Design an enzyme around this catalytic site. Structure first.
Site, short mmCIF file in Angstrom:
data_model
loop_
_atom_site.label_atom_id
_atom_site.label_comp_id
_atom_site.label_asym_id
_atom_site.label_seq_id
_atom_site.Cartn_x
_atom_site.Cartn_y
_atom_site.Cartn_z
N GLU A 1 -16.05 6.23 -0.61
CA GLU A 1 -15.27 5.54 0.42
C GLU A 1 -14.04 4.85 -0.15
O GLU A 1 -12.96 4.91 0.45
CB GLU A 1 -16.13 4.53 1.17
CG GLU A 1 -17.20 5.12 2.07
CD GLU A 1 -16.66 5.81 3.31
OE1 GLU A 1 -15.48 5.56 3.64
OE2 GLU A 1 -17.40 6.60 3.92
N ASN B 1 -6.23 4.73 10.78
CA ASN B 1 -6.72 5.83 11.59
C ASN B 1 -5.83 6.10 12.79
O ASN B 1 -5.02 5.28 13.24
CB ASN B 1 -8.15 5.54 12.06
CG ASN B 1 -9.11 5.42 10.89
OD1 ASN B 1 -9.28 6.36 10.12
ND2 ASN B 1 -9.70 4.24 10.72
N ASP C 1 -6.58 6.18 15.93
CA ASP C 1 -6.87 5.37 17.10
C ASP C 1 -6.35 3.95 17.00
O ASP C 1 -6.66 3.11 17.84
CB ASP C 1 -8.37 5.36 17.40
CG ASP C 1 -9.19 4.62 16.35
OD1 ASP C 1 -8.66 4.29 15.27
OD2 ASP C 1 -10.39 4.40 16.63
N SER D 1 -7.05 1.87 14.57
CA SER D 1 -7.96 1.07 13.75
C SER D 1 -7.65 1.29 12.27
O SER D 1 -6.95 2.22 11.88
CB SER D 1 -9.40 1.44 14.05
OG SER D 1 -9.76 2.70 13.51
N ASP E 1 -9.72 0.94 8.31
CA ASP E 1 -10.95 0.75 7.55
C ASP E 1 -10.66 -0.14 6.34
O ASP E 1 -9.68 0.09 5.63
CB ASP E 1 -11.50 2.08 7.04
CG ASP E 1 -11.74 3.07 8.17
OD1 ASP E 1 -12.29 2.65 9.20
OD2 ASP E 1 -11.39 4.25 7.99
N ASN F 1 -14.75 -0.48 9.69
CA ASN F 1 -13.73 -0.16 10.68
C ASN F 1 -13.44 -1.29 11.66
O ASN F 1 -14.34 -1.96 12.15
CB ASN F 1 -14.22 1.07 11.45
CG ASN F 1 -13.19 1.56 12.46
OD1 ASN F 1 -13.28 1.26 13.64
ND2 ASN F 1 -12.19 2.28 11.96
#
Ligand SMILES: [Cl-]
Length: 129
Positions: free
Chosen positions: A35, A46, A48, A50, A52, A59
């Site tokens: 990750e 991301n 959308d 968002s 991380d 998220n």
């Protein structure tokens, strides 16, 4: 901070992740490797809106509040900035909530693709725990 493999394993064991909700410690170390490459300041945007955050790439749509993500639910009740600390406590506490939500460690895409189905206990081999 960039953790070493065994350094992170020890820290995660102290915070109660070994066997937590059925997931042995190697799962968590493997997830962090793929990750974030063990970096507490990793961030990824991301499509959308968002982001991380941190060593376990938590998220901002569902779990932490970053103030800029539409539809934020903040289920860990924590600012996302706290997940970029060199101390992993806030990230671990939120990860415990994520894995209990329902769907286990399937929240972590890199875990599902690159760790699940392999011998994950190799990730803690040679560490003093
Ligand atoms: Cl924030």
């Amino acid at each position: 901070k960039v953790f070493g493999r065994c350094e992170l394993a020890a820290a995660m064991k102290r915070h109660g992740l070994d066997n937590y909700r059925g997931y042995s410690l190697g799962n968590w170390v493997c997830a962090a490797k793929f990750e974030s490459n063990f970096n507490t300041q990793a961030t990824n945007r991301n499509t959308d809106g968002s982001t991380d955050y941190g060593i376990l790439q938590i998220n901002s749509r569902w779990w932490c509040n970053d103030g800029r993500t539409p539809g934020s639910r903040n289920l860990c009740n924590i600012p996302c900035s706290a997940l970029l600390s060199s101390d992993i406590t806030a990230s671990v506490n939120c990860a415990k909530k994520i894995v209990s939500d329902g769907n286990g460690m399937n929240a972590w895409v890199a875990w599902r693709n690159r760790c699940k189905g392999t011998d994950v206990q190799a990730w803690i081999r040679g560490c003093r725990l």
